[PDB]
Amino acid sequence: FVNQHLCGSDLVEALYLVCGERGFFYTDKGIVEQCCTSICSLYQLENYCN
Numbered sequence: 001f002v003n004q005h006l007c008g009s010d011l012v013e014a015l016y017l018v019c020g021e022r023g024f025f026y027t028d029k030g031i032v033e034q035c036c037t038s039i040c041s042l043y044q045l046e047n048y049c050n
Helices: 007-018
Strands: none
Touching: none
């Protein structure tokens, strides 16, 4: 969807548009530190949801 930073608000909003089913995975938070101030990788973000 985007090739820049998104941070929770967008990180979560995207993980939502990324999967759109069971609210993707968002509890442990093994990320958000490089996808908010740094760029991420839609490929990896598309693997958080089941």
